[PDB]
Structure 1
Amino acid sequence: AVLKIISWNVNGLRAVHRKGFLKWFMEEKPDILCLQEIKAAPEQLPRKLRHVEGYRSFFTPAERKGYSGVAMYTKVPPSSLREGFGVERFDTEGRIQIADFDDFLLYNIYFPNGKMSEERLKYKLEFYDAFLEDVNRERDSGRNVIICGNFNTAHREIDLARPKENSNVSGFLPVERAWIDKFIENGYVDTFRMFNSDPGQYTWWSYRTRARERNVGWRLDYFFVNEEFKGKVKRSWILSDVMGSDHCPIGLEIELL
């Protein structure tokens, strides 16, 4: 009895719907699908997206018209669904879906991009900070956590095609690479690295300069568990072939109880 979970930074759900989304969503059959950067409120989506037979859908849209936003489809509904950490700034941008699956917490997080500004960065890290204290509190409470989404940060050099030219860009800043160390040091396993240790494995590629076409990308989308849960995940992979976004989907699968 294995639970397949998919994360995807979708970059416009209305757009991905126009590029075969649902077709894939039913071909690939995941018990939980977490989507990030949805760029929509639910009343903007076609009913075909709001209502997917088999799945209860949940949407956390920002209070900024078609910006950010996370979503989730799921066969077995969560016992409850939290949408923020407890700080307005982070809570109001459709970035947080913590969904209690009475077995584990599934954290669907779209972490802030810090490319575009120093004050939008910073926000990214303070967001990171707010997330950690939170996940800590939950797994200290003995709750097992699965965290997926768009971290917007390559952890180590191996997590992007061109680390060296990228030292100064947000996404591979030593400041942000630091936090993931902290994050892991706090007892979280980068589930993908539990299986693959090869380079050139990515989940993001710049649209401009047609980067995807030749694998010149980054690994920004992650599946994480707590050390204590490491045992019960039996594959974290990357759906490198799924199209219609500058990111791509990443898969996990876990176990019964």
Structure 2
Amino acid sequence: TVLKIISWNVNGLRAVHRKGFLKWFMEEKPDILCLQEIKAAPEQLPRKLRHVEGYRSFFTPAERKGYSGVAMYTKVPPSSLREGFGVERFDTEGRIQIADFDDFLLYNIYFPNGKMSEERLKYKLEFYDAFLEDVNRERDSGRNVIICGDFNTAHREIDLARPKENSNVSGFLPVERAWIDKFIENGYVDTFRMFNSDPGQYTSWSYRTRARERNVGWRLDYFFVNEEFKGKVKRSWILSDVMGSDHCPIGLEIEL
């Protein structure tokens, strides 16, 4: 039995709903759909967006209205979900949803954008630190883990169109790239790069005219698994053709 998981930063759930979300969801038919940037309390959602036939949905909004938020649609519900690392400043921004599926924990994370200020870059880097502590604790306790979402950092030069121009911009700073190195070194695998070693493979493009059309993008969205679990991963790909956000979805197929 194969399990298909999709991750997608939708840049506002109500917005992507106007741009073909439900039609796409019905075509792709994943077992689990992880979303970032819902920008809505579930009460603000139309019924047909809240309840999609065949799926249980779980929403983790931020405390701040119209900001951040993650969600998960799943055919089979998890035994429970955890919505934080146990650190207040990281747990109130609707960034963390960790679903316990028994065979694995699924971390659906919307990692912070560090571009707007030094304080928010510090927040991003400390969030990275808290995340690594959390996943390591779970992995060390014997859990297999799948981590998906918007990491807001491109790992290597291959992972964005303009590496030189962005080496002093959050998203491609040496310190952020070093954190991704450290994460992987701790025993996790960037699943896309198990299967695809090509350039030009991005998950995000500015809305600035022509950016997406010129493939001036960044790979910001990833599926990671712990090393012990990588043998179960069959596919990891980018759904580059799917419109409606400044990010496109990414996919993982596993067989347990």
Structure-2-length-normalised TM-score: 0.99
1:210 is displaced (CA, Å) by 2.5
Once residues 45 and 248 of structure 2 are traced to their aligned partners in structure 1, the CA distance between those partners, rounded to angstroms, is 21
Tell me the SS of whatever aligns to 2:218. coil
Tell me the SS of whatever aligns to 1:125. helix
Once residues 72 and 148 of structure 1 are traced to their aligned partners in structure 2, the CA distance between those partners, rounded to angstroms, is 11
Q: How does 1:1-257 map to 2 (within 5 A)?
A: 1-255=1-255, 257=256
1:204 is displaced (CA, Å) by 0.4
Once residues 37 and 122 of structure 2 are traced to their aligned partners in structure 1, the CA distance between those partners, rounded to angstroms, is 19
1:135 is displaced (CA, Å) by 0.2
User: Following superposition, which runs of at least 4 residues in structure 1 exceed 4 angstroms of deviation?
Assistant: none
Relative to structure 2, which stretch is displaced further, 3-12 or 41-50? 41-50
Count of aligned pairs between the two proteins: 256
Once residues 230 and 161 of structure 2 are traced to their aligned partners in structure 1, the CA distance between those partners, rounded to angstroms, is 27
Once residues 138 and 161 of structure 2 are traced to their aligned partners in structure 1, the CA distance between those partners, rounded to angstroms, is 35
Q: Structure 1: state its 5+ residue gaps.
A: none
Tell me the SS of whatever aligns to 2:142. coil
1:68 is displaced (CA, Å) by 0.3
Q: Deviations over 1:150-189 (max 9, x none)?
A: 0000000000000001100000000100000000000000
Q: Deviations over 1:213-240 (max 9, x none)?
A: 1211000000000010110000000000
1:133 is displaced (CA, Å) by 0.3
1:50 is displaced (CA, Å) by 0.8
1:208 is displaced (CA, Å) by 1.1
Q: Deviations over 1:16-60 (max 9, x none)?
A: 000010011011000000000111111111111110110000000
Once residues 48 and 33 of structure 2 are traced to their aligned partners in structure 1, the CA distance between those partners, rounded to angstroms, is 16
Q: Deviations over 1:66-90 (max 9, x none)?
A: 1000000000100110000000101
Once residues 209 and 222 of structure 1 are traced to their aligned partners in structure 2, the CA distance between those partners, rounded to angstroms, is 25
Tell me the SS of whatever aligns to 1:213. coil
Once residues 248 and 241 of structure 1 are traced to their aligned partners in structure 2, the CA distance between those partners, rounded to angstroms, is 8
Once residues 81 and 217 of structure 2 are traced to their aligned partners in structure 1, the CA distance between those partners, rounded to angstroms, is 33
Once residues 149 and 211 of structure 2 are traced to their aligned partners in structure 1, the CA distance between those partners, rounded to angstroms, is 21
Once residues 159 and 89 of structure 2 are traced to their aligned partners in structure 1, the CA distance between those partners, rounded to angstroms, is 29
Once residues 80 and 254 of structure 1 are traced to their aligned partners in structure 2, the CA distance between those partners, rounded to angstroms, is 21
Once residues 182 and 9 of structure 1 are traced to their aligned partners in structure 2, the CA distance between those partners, rounded to angstroms, is 24
1:139 is displaced (CA, Å) by 0.6
Once residues 160 and 27 of structure 1 are traced to their aligned partners in structure 2, the CA distance between those partners, rounded to angstroms, is 29
Once residues 250 and 16 of structure 2 are traced to their aligned partners in structure 1, the CA distance between those partners, rounded to angstroms, is 16
Once residues 169 and 36 of structure 1 are traced to their aligned partners in structure 2, the CA distance between those partners, rounded to angstroms, is 22
Once residues 40 and 80 of structure 2 are traced to their aligned partners in structure 1, the CA distance between those partners, rounded to angstroms, is 22
Once residues 55 and 121 of structure 1 are traced to their aligned partners in structure 2, the CA distance between those partners, rounded to angstroms, is 36
Structure-1-length-normalised TM-score: 0.99
Q: Deviations over 1:89-123 (max 9, x none)?
A: 01000000000000000000000000111101110
1:209 is displaced (CA, Å) by 3.0
Once residues 226 and 210 of structure 2 are traced to their aligned partners in structure 1, the CA distance between those partners, rounded to angstroms, is 36
Once residues 163 and 38 of structure 2 are traced to their aligned partners in structure 1, the CA distance between those partners, rounded to angstroms, is 28
Q: Structure 2: state its 5+ residue gaps.
A: none
Once residues 163 and 46 of structure 2 are traced to their aligned partners in structure 1, the CA distance between those partners, rounded to angstroms, is 40
Once residues 17 and 210 of structure 2 are traced to their aligned partners in structure 1, the CA distance between those partners, rounded to angstroms, is 21
Once residues 248 and 23 of structure 1 are traced to their aligned partners in structure 2, the CA distance between those partners, rounded to angstroms, is 15
